[PDB]
Amino acid sequence: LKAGNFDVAYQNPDKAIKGGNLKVAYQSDSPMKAQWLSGLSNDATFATMSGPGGGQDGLFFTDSGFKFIKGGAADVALDKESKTATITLRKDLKWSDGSEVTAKDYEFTYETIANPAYGSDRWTDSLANIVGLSDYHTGKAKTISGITFPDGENGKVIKVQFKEMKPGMTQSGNGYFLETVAPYQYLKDVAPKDLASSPKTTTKPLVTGPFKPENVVAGESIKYVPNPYYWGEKPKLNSITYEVVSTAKSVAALSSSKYDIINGMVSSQYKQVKNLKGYKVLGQQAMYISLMYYNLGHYDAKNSINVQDRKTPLQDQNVRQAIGYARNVAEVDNKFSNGLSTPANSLIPPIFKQFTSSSVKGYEKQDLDKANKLLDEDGWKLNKSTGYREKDGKELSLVYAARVGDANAETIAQNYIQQWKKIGVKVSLYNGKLMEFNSWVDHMTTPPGANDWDITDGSWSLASEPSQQDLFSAAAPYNFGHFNDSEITKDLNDIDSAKSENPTYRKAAFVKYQEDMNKKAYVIPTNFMLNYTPVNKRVVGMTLDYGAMNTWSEIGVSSA
């Protein structure tokens, strides 16, 4: 497997020893917050650092596209006609004290999120689609009627009944049902309001993963040791340490061999890392899209709907396409990205092979000739004295709300402004300078929307169920440019329809959506990204494959 020029795995020619200590770090300038219950945890840093311990007790394995497969701590099966997901825990699934993981432990996760007495921030409207769960959530019911136990609470099977099936239910991260267990017998006598701050969920938890936390240093680190009761094979390693490292100290830590692996390293730091001997740098495509937005309307908050009613030459499809074709995204990525940005052909990255195809063509190749032709044929005619096109005596002049963030952000925006000059479009930065991130978020998300920008850039961390209703639907506040198109609405709905419970149909629906979005050009995909990870050359079995389910048990070292 390759991701760009990067290897996804480090194929160590040397065998792993039996034993050893692996030292891993996560780059963060903010402390970890240890919370072992998924429902009560809001810290992404700790969520990653929980990996050796089971990832906050995740149950389901997936393929490399995040589609559920059998063979993990539990299996999940959908039955359309029952409207039910059935979760079957393995016979051998135990907690790290040797207690059995039972059906109650899965139901208890739902209580931790849905009963407000626990203080969870993770309730979502999606959960209201489980029979009886909204009523449990609001106190109307004392149990969750939609969750049943074919073989009792102390058996291994849980049935979850829905009001409606959803096609995303075969993707991890879908949110319509949950994927973790919580140790009910261990935690049952803690008052719900005290659970999140209990030692039992912070410093001294029970877990289900290949390692268990022997010591947690608040804000900083976890020492992991083998979990005797893990259902899989014993791990190779005798211990793993997982520590927070600051951005400012990561490279030196690599120089000093303090860590074998550092995760979360940002795109900036790379050329300091890429030359360091003794490391193999692996890469993987990120769950990420960046894109260019055109401002085409406003958001009606009272009616929760985008109205595409702004006066702008960008209402013309030809103009939107031309401005897309004029960019030099590939060249910009070559010049500046250190290889960590690659041009997007579509709005969904190819991580999701079941929802994407490289056959989908977008604006990944500059085409100034096409851009100039589109504008000409739309009556935007090139003025001799100025070098800019006009229609009814008005120049084609746009405001670009480019933002701070990328290290070469200024330079990149200027690249684009210069390409746009080549097609006779005059483009200036919003107030003559880059917008700070918080100001940009405010500008884009405060209804009804501003009228003083034309072009902007946005970027998103995508969920492993990648429907984009929350980004581009007519009702979405995140639809920053406020387009509303009947064909796109039909396409978005088709992706989430009952017919899309069939994966071949859903693929086709995603592909049509991606093509239609490109053609309409209300938004223009810009880049995908690559995450990089330095790995000490002694590490054996390391891979960033999203399909690799057993890495913590398999990983080892070739020498102590």
Partner: peptide, 5 residues
């Protein structure tokens, strides 16, 4: 499900 970033 998706967040700015």
């Amino acid at each position: 499900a998706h967040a700015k970033a």
